[PDB]
Amino acid sequence: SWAQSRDEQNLLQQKRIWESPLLLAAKDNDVQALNKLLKYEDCKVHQRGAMGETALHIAALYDNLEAAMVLMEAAPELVFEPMTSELYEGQTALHIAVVNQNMNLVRALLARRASVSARATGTAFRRSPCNLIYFGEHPLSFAACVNSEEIVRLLIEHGADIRAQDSLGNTVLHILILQPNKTFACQMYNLLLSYDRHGDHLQPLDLVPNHQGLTPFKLAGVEGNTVMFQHLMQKRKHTQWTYGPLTSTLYDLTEIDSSGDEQSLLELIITTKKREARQILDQTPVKELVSLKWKRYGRPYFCMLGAIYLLYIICFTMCCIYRPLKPRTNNRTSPRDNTLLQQKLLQEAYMTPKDDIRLVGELVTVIGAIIILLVEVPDGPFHVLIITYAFMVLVTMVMRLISASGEVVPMSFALVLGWCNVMYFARGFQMLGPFTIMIQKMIFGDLMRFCWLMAVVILGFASAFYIIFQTEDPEELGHFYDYPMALFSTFELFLTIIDGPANYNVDLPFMYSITYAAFAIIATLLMLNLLIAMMGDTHWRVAHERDELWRAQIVATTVMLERKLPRCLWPRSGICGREYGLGDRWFLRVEDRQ
Amino acid sequence: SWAQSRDEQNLLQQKRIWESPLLLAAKDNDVQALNKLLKYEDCKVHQRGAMGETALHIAALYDNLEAAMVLMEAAPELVFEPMTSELYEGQTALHIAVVNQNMNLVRALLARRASVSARATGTAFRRSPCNLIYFGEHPLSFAACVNSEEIVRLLIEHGADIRAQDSLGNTVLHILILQPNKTFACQMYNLLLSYDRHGDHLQPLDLVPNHQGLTPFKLAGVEGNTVMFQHLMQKRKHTQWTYGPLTSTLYDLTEIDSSGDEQSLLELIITTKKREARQILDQTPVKELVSLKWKRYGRPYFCMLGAIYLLYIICFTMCCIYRPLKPRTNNRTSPRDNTLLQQKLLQEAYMTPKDDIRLVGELVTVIGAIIILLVEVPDGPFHVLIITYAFMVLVTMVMRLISASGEVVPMSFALVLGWCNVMYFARGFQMLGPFTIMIQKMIFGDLMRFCWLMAVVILGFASAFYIIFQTEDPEELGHFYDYPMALFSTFELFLTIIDGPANYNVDLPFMYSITYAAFAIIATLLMLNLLIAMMGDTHWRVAHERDELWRAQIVATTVMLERKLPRCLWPRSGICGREYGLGDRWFLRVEDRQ
Numbered sequence A, B: 001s002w003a004q005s006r007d008e009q010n011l012l013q014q015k016r017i018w019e020s021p022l023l024l025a026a027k028d029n030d031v032q033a034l035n036k037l038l039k040y041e042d043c044k045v046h047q048r049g050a051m052g053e054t055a056l057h058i059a060a061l062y063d064n065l066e067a068a069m070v071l072m073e074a075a076p077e078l079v080f081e082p083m084t085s086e087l088y089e090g091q092t093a094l095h096i097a098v099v100n101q102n103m104n105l106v107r108a109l110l111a112r113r114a115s116v117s118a119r120a121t122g123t124a125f126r127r128s129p130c131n132l133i134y135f136g137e138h139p140l141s142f143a144a145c146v147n148s149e150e151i152v153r154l155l156i157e158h159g160a161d162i163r164a165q166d167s168l169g170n171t172v173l174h175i176l177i178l179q180p181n182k183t184f185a186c187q188m189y190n191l192l193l194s195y196d197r198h199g200d201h202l203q204p205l206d207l208v209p210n211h212q213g214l215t216p217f218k219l220a221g222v223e224g225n226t227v228m229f230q231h232l233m234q235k236r237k238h239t240q241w242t243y244g245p246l247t248s249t250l251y252d253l254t255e256i257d258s259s260g261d262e263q264s265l266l267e268l269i270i271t272t273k274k275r276e277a278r279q280i281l282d283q284t285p286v287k288e289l290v291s292l293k294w295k296r297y298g299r300p301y302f303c304m305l306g307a308i309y310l311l312y313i314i315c316f317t318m319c320c321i322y323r324p325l326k327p328r329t330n331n332r333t334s335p336r337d338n339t340l341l342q343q344k345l346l347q348e349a350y351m352t353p354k355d356d357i358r359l360v361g362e363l364v365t366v367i368g369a370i371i372i373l374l375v376e377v378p379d380g381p382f383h384v385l386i387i388t389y390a391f392m393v394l395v396t397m398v399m400r401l402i403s404a405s406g407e408v409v410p411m412s413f414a415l416v417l418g419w420c421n422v423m424y425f426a427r428g429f430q431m432l433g434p435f436t437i438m439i440q441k442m443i444f445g446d447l448m449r450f451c452w453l454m455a456v457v458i459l460g461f462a463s464a465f466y467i468i469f470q471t472e473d474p475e476e477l478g479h480f481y482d483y484p485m486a487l488f489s490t491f492e493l494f495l496t497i498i499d500g501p502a503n504y505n506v507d508l509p510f511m512y513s514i515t516y517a518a519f520a521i522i523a524t525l526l527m528l529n530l531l532i533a534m535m536g537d538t539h540w541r542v543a544h545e546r547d548e549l550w551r552a553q554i555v556a557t558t559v560m561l562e563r564k565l566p567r568c569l570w571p572r573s574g575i576c577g578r579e580y581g582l583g584d585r586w587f588l589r590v591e592d593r594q
Ligand SMILES: CCCCCCCC/C=C\CCCCCCCC(=O)O[C@@H](COC(=O)CCCCCCCCCCCCCCC)COP(=O)([O-])OCC[N+](C)(C)C
Pocket: A451, A452, A455, A456, A459, A481, A482, A483, A484, A487
């Protein structure tokens, strides 16, 4: 399909080199083969192939200085060449010898008036996961990424705009953050900003956003580039006083903190898929800012929401304890029919003043449900449950207003959805927070992978056991009446949570006692203690990084509280300017000791 | 509040520097800006701000030699300056340039008759956890802590008392033990004691106590400073003979052992909150002294107390086995009323001579209870239980003397409080001692953190299950009658200590079998084996450091036995002086091999 075609275009490129001898001698520099063909007939000086390549392209792509130079006097009208077939579209040979770091050949290109503007918008230059280089779309963006100091100075002299944006809006400082060698990215970064000693009006190149709106300070935090992040912090510092080993220092907090309706750096670190971005979250202004927001305004508001939710769940719980039951009207259709009670009706529900006090609690309940949805629906996993909990009150609101069957099951959902959301509020404690991360990674990581192997062993053995108690007396190790019940027995004999079956009274069915021994060795010993050994590794894995998993829970919570509460209750953190003479910016003081 | 105000006072300091140009040019040395203002109008030569700072202070705090010297001829009447607003109170600039290690500027201060006496009693110099330096309150105490060898010699020449005590009584040798760099603390320590070649009367500076009474030998043991501790031991040694690889050595034991009613070093290491202090407990005189006290007098007395307590608990146990029961008077109020017996009365209790022998045992019991309280109340966790055990005998003493209901429950406390105090006496064995440390750290470390998450899952599911068996026949998986009993069922289905419920006889309630499968995956597999993986780490953690946890149990026990037993049964450990000609001190011989 796609990658098949891309490999075909590589060898069909290899074919048309071997077709034309001018294209062939461009690869291996046979100057004899070159200057024979040039002193001959015209012989297709700009004939293209599948990709749009030329002989000057191939001599550059296979590192031929001499074969290219002889071709230059032969045809100087070429050099402005857009290699263009949908995947290489825009690329020049002046792109090529820069990526190959060929300083002699790009000198001859800039001698013949090369184009340091050319936008390589071909799909092998997009920022995609299927293209394992992203160097930009410009020669100066190419020269920067490959650590090519000489050429970088050379290109700008010939008119290479340091400010030019590619088809994602990224400047060359945005592209240097995306490079995998984080240390060599730093040195080429300063060389481009040094040359921006001109042009300080309109965001002097280290404030210019892309189409996403991010600056190179905020993009280093989103991409997790901590080395570039600690570099750019030094511009946003201010040493204040150095009394011995003490040191006071102000941090800038204009792009780190919530400037306005813009997405702050703490919002973008939480709302990203990249895992390395959460190592920004303990750097020297950020860790102090989160601790200041949590200890002074985040933890008091979170504990008061945790207490109001705890009373509301009791005010839910006590109403569904006292739910309208009555003795039944009809009688037993079977001896197995074994209810002794029945749901009451709304007409005869609220008769006493005792029940008048009850419906207060249920009106506290239902009003709480529409408050939840009006908060949440106009927008992690506890978001899903609290929407499901509000849904389950408004289900059994509807079912009682038309007085129908099965109130219990929408409530049977509701309690465990309701009370396990108190475990949400366990993140407000250092020593209880990452316990819920353990619970998740065991379910979605260890249960949901091994569960398929457990259920295969169930349906194997539970069918195997149900043909042994089908032709028997169903009260006498009646652990198997039904393929439903046999899936309920073997689920609870795998786990050893009910008794391993035996009756020891009657002449027992034979093949069973062979079979349950086969079962109990492989289920209750081998595959149950597989899972216990699995989840023991998950516990060890999450308890190891337990501090940094809790800190990411606090940043997620503090951002969530700050956006939704009104500004008159969440004061802006830090010390304001304009009275201490620093600017209108909002700073933060940190004092340390070395 | 507090730290908010402290940061405001740092930037308001930064404001009033930027207000007055004399204060501004004190920071960055603009001598031009200085000598313009000085050849002008008087212009407030000693105007203060919020903190009481001066221009000579700011030039010293921001390291200006030249700006300070020009200011000295301008106003030589300053230098005696008490910077004084409640938090900086007492501090001189002569304090400041010493902490900044500015040897040229303090030369010009001592040229202009500086004050090496000044007591920086401001709250930013107290020994508090919120001030992360404690260098003392004096310039010589400052110069010592910052490792400033040159200035330390210089100050004493200008009359810096090495013996001066700050507002906690600590001398400079006390303050050098509190410094975090333990190796550089040692070298500056000797330089101050070398200069105490004068003044040997009245405790020659290495015996002088603070207001707590501690010497620098005993303070190094309380603070856990093992490097300073092994240093000061060398003064308290005596090599005795060196026969080949053998070596005999006497240790001093005047401050290590219990000199009298004073608090010995072994008492202060146990009664401290610092954790590093228990690494003193295996140094070369201390480890031999504890082993000598334990093997010769501690372990015999502890095993005899462990045997007398074991007989007393049997003498408690057998009486509350034979407790006054009789057949009941009334009859069954319900079929569920199912006692077949009743408490007897004190009148008809002691009728036979068999019961006369019983009350002997109970008088052994009660006398044992008031002995415990008369021992203990006029003063760790086994202290709390043995006071609670003595309380529970004297509860059921009172209840029988007025012949009332419920003897059993104060006794039901009493047994498990009584017999688990035998586990106290497991510290008298090397291989049984730190088992009780495991039991504590699992309860207060692993249970009491995760218990909140277990109970949340209980009330979630046990409410969820109790609405499924409310409208049923309560004898048929009657594991749920009551929200009390449902909290008792789900506590014992979480733990899988009772059978996972099933009846398999009647048409079963439907939503239950969905729900218990939801429950048994998350309770009996996921969250129960969370705790087993948690407490397995606690076991590994305590069994790793199991020798040094047992040795701290012995020091705690030996000190406790020695204080309470009379002196005529606990002889003073070691070899006395005054007959072997060493002094009146009590020494200890150790023989080793290298
Ligand atoms: C990890 C997730 C695992 C999910 C599955 C775990 C189980 C959850 C499944 C279902 C959840 C609950 C729904 C009930 C469905 C069963 C219907 C039933 O029992 O009816 C009948 C049986 O009929 C059957 O046996 C149907 C089952 C076919 C074999 C299993 C395939 C389904 C899953 C496999 C997919 C492979 C996935 C695994 C590998 C990829 C009942 O018969 P009876 O009334 O007793 O008749 C008496 C006979 N007499 C009349 C002669 C006297």
